[PDB]
């Protein structure tokens, strides 16, 4: 509405050379102009000075020292990184990705890449220890590359065994802003989109990743600057004793983009595996049912909460399922399956990563199996069908679903126990006056091929109805 007022003021003032003379007189004797330039940067006419201004503005937001030597060749200079486009060493590698964003109008991703390179050095070091700290980092990616090389030497199978059931995970080595990431899981539901071929040209977001890198920590730790792996077993990896090494105030961290709901016993077996406490302070433990529901409701964004009230609805082509998670179920230990959320993992030497990632894989498999019942679909108060299902845990990595007999009147319980990342065993409990329903091996194969409770229930219902 200020346009009319501006027009009126302009009309009042419209009733120049004098302004130029006054400015010249001032000239002869801050951030606002930069803000105007960076606001005009988005629509800049494509030309070499325009891209120079765009890059200098990008450096201004990123804090990089904006220094230019020519119109086409520019240098990014900071404490310890130096990149030229047409420190403590030369350019790492002329990766084609950064050229790919630079040659096109993809400067936002270029800015994020620059921020990532800067964030690689968010360390509190004194520019010498920091230097050494990044040198150690190299040693770590060499060690994980050797781990992957050894596992490739173990068997010449596909990357599926590399990701799902194997030491550490699939490698994407660091290049530019993308850190070195490790693939450990893909769900069968996520595997098939709308049958996806898993050739070497796999995307980075196809599933979930597990990055490993260094952040400063409050404690001082002994870390190897030199590569730790020099000798390789035929099929194993052995880590040589450290100390070169020195007490560097940092730690190696494995970063997860999103938190995973993990049980308490997983936490203590994690400190059993590693020894470094995950949480600085004791957090509040809650049953992981609400945690998993909030986690896997985020895979399908919606600003409006569903108001599920622990009564979850599932839509199938022939069946409609009403689910009751039945939280706070009475376990033999006297408590429920308490759980928390994990986002960061701490470790000391590269010999800890395989067991940690195996336990993470097992927990993710169990969580996905439990959360397959979790759906946003609503088919409310439908009188036909609407089978009632109740989930009740029994022990760690164990649970059971109890439901009415599909044909008879007694109850029937099916108990699931997860053995490994892709190993799940199944048992059946039925009354004395009943008929044959299914076999345990069939249920185990269905779980191993789909990893979803509603699909398993559908298969059992169909096989029992066919009899």
Partner 1 sequence: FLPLVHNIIKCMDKDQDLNALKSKFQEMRKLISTMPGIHLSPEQQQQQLQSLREQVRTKNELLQKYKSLCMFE
Partner 2 sequence: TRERLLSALEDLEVLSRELIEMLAISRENQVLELLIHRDGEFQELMKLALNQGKIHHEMQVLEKEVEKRDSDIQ
Residue 413, strand partner residues: 402, 429
12 binds partner 2 (CB under 8 A): no
Residue from 25, 28, 29, 32 that binds partner 2 (CB under 8 A)? 32
Among 20, 86, 195, 304, binds partner 2 (CB under 8 A): 20
Q: Compare residues 23 and 310 and give the one whose CB is closer to partner 2.
A: 23
28 or 126: CB nearest partner 2: 28
Q: Which stretch binds partner 2 (CB under 8 A): 34-42, 70-78, 88-96, 388-396?
A: 34-42
- Beta pairing, strands 181-185 & 208-224: antiparallel
**Cβ of residue 52: shortest distance to partner 2, in angstroms?**
21
Site string for partner 1, 23-62 (x = CB under 8 A): ----------x--xx--x--xxx-x-xx--x---------
| 4 counts as binding partner 1 under rule CB under 8 A | no
CA distances in angstroms from 13 to 8, 224, 279, 431, listed in the order given: 9, 72, 66, 94
Select the span of 10-18, 66-74, 237-245, 326-334 touching partner 2 (CB under 8 A).
10-18
Of 8, 23, 157, 310, the residue at the interface with partner 2 (CB under 8 A) is 23
71 binds partner 1 per the rule CB under 8 A: no
Q: Please report how close the Cβ of residue 48 comes to partner 2 at its closest, in angstroms.
A: 21
3-state secondary structure the chain: CHHHHHHHHHHHHCCCHHHHHHHHHHHHCCHHHHHHHHHHCCCCCCCHHHHHHHHHHHHHHHCCEEEECCCCCEEEECCCCEEEECCCCCCCCCCHHHHHHHHCCCHHHHHHHHHHHHHCCCCCCCCCHHHHHHHHHHHHHHHHHHHHHHHHHHCCCCHHHHHCCCCCCEEECCECCECCEEEEECCHHHHCCCCCCCCCCCCCCCCEEEEEEEEEEEEEEEEECCCCCCCEECCEECCCCCCCEEEEEEEEEEEEEEEEEEEHHHHHHHHHHCCCCCCCCCCCCEEHHHHHHHHHCCCCCCCCCCCCCCEEEEECCCCEEEEECCCCCCCCCCCCCEEEEEEEEEECCCCCHHHHHHHHHHHHHHHHHHHCCCCCCCCCCCCCCCEEEEEEECCCCEEEEEEECCCCCCEEEEEEEECCCCCEEEEEECCCCCCCCCCHHHHHHHHHHHCCHHHHHHHHHHHHHHC
Q: Closer to partner 1 at the Cβ: 37 or 290?
A: 37
**Restricting to residues 320-349, which ones interact with partner 1 according to CB under 8 A?**
none
Contact between 46 and partner 2 per CB under 8 A: no
The distance of closest approach from Cβ of residue 26 to partner 2 in the complex, given in angstroms and rounded to an integer, is: 7
Residues in the chain: 467
Residue 67 CB, nearest approach to partner 2 (Å): 24
Residue 45 interacts with partner 2 (CB under 8 A): yes or no: no
CB of residue 298 vs partner 1: minimum separation in angstroms? 41
Q: If binding is defined by CB under 8 A, does position 190 make contact with partner 1?
A: no
Rounded Cα distance, 272 and 411, in Å: 40
Cα–Cα dist 174/327, whole Å: 42
CB of 33 to partner 1, least distance (A): 7
Q: Considering only residues 17, 31, 43, 233, which one is a binding residue for partner 2 as defined by CB under 8 A?
A: 43
By CB under 8 A, is residue 25 in contact with partner 2? no
Q: Which does 53 bind (CB under 5 to 8 A by kind): partner 2, partner 1, none?
A: partner 1
* Minimum gap (Å) between residue 43 Cβ and partner 1: 6
Residue 119 makes contact with partner 1 by CB under 8 A: no
**CA 356 – CA 255 distance, rounded (Å):** 12
Tell me which residues in 233-252 interact with partner 2 (CB under 8 A): none
Residue 44's binding partner among partner 2, partner 1, none (Cβ under 5 to 8 angstroms by kind) is partner 1
Cβ atoms within 10 Å of 306's Cβ, excluding its own: 14
Residue from the set 4, 26, 197, 467 that interacts with partner 2 by CB under 8 A: 26
CB closer to partner 1 out of 50 and 95: 50
Residue 37 binding partner per list partner 2, partner 1, none, with a CB distance cut-off of 5 to 8 Å that depends on partner kind: partner 1
Query: Does residue 4 bind partner 2 (CB under 8 A)?
Result: no
Contact set with partner 1 (CB under 8 A): 20, 33, 36-37, 40, 43-45, 47, 49-50, 53
Contact set with partner 2 (CB under 8 A): 2-3, 6, 10, 13-14, 16, 19-20, 22-23, 26-27, 32-33, 36, 39-40, 43
């Amino acid at each position: 509405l200020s346009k009319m007022s501006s027009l009126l003021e302009r009309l009042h003032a419209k009733f120049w050379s004098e302004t130029i003379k006054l400015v010249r007189q001032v000239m002869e004797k801050q951030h606002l102009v930069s803000c105007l330039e960076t606001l005009q940067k988005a629509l800049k006419v494509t030309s070499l000075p325009a891209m120079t201004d765009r890059l200098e503005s990008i450096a201004r937001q990123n804090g990089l020292g904006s220094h230019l030597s020519a119109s086409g060749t520019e240098c990014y200079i900071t404490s310890d990184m130096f990149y030229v486009e047409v420190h403590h060493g030369e350019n790492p590698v002329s990766c084609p990705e950064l050229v790919q964003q630079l040659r096109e109008k993809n400067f936002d991703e270029f800015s994020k890449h620059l921020k990532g390179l800067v964030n690689l050095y968010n360390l509190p070091g004194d520019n010498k220890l920091k230097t050494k700290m990044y040198l150690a980092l190299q040693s770590l990616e060499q060690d994980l590359s050797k781990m992957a090389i050894m596992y490739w030497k173990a068997t010449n199978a596909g990357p599926l065994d590399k990701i799902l059931h194997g030491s550490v995970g699939y490698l994407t080595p660091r290049s530019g802003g993308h850190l070195m990431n490790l693939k450990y899981y893909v769900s069968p539901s996520d595997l098939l989109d709308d049958i996806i071929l898993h050739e070497n040209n796999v995307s980075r977001s196809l599933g979930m990743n597990a990055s490993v890198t260094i952040e400063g920590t409050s404690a001082v730790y002994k870390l190897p600057i030199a590569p730790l792996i020099m000798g390789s077993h035929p099929v194993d990896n052995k880590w040589t004793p450290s100390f070169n090494s020195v007490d560097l105030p940092a730690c190696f961290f494995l970063k997860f983009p999103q938190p995973i709901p993990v049980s308490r016993a997983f936490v203590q077996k994690l400190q059993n595996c590693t020894g470094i406490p995950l949480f600085e302070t004791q957090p509040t433990y809650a049953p992981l049912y609400e945690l998993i529901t909030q986690f896997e409701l985020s895979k399908d964004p919606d600003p409006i909460p569903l108001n599920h009230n622990m009564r979850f609805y599932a839509a199938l082509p022939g069946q409609q399922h009403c689910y009751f998670l039945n939280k706070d179920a009475p376990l033999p230990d006297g408590r429920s399956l308490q759980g928390t959320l994990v986002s960061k993992i701490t470790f000391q030497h590269p010999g800890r990563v395989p067991l940690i990632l195996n336990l993470i894989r097992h927990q993710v498999a169990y969580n996905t199996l439990i959360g397959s019942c979790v759906k946003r679909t609503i088919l409310k108060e439908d009188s036909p069908g609407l089978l009632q299902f109740e989930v009740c845990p029994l022990s760690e990595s164990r649970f059971s679903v109890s439901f009415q007999h599909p044909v008879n009147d007694s109850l029937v319980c099916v108990v699931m126990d997860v053995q490994d990342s892709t190993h799940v065993s199944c048992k059946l409990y039925k009354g004395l006056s009943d008929a044959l329903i299914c076999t345990d091996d069939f249920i185990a194969k269905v779980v191993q091929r789909c990893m979803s409770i509603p699909v398993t229930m559908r298969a059992i219902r169909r096989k029992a109805e066919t009899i």
